[PDB]
Amino acid sequence: SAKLECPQDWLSHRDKCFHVSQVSNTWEEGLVDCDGKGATLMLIQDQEELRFLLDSIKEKYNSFWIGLRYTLPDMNWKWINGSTLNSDVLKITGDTENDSCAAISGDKVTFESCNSDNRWICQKELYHETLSNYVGYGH
Structure with a gap:
């Protein structure tokens, strides 16, 4: 499924194409690293996305930064490109009051400090x- 085309080093899904860098950086660095290919840091659209992530990720138990930033004031998560997080997919906080960014860890989405x-x-x-809607606290 290639809506538009992407390079061969990337896995296409519907209307985006992905690259799982197994090398580490901070969230901010990985963001800039994605810009290097004329790409963006991963902007999750749906559950198919993450399911396809899991297929490309494979190992799961690492932590991979996606373009998820908790935006204040609004207490929702926007992406770096100006898109808005489908909060209804998996565990992500709605209101946290932190500078926490999110990362793929396991089969789920998790959130930590961008500096890890x-x-x-x-x-x-x-x-x-x-x-997006609003997860609230996560309860």
């Missing part, structure tokens, strides 16, 4: 979307 040494996922855009 984690790997990152880049997506090379075919399209982009916005749809």
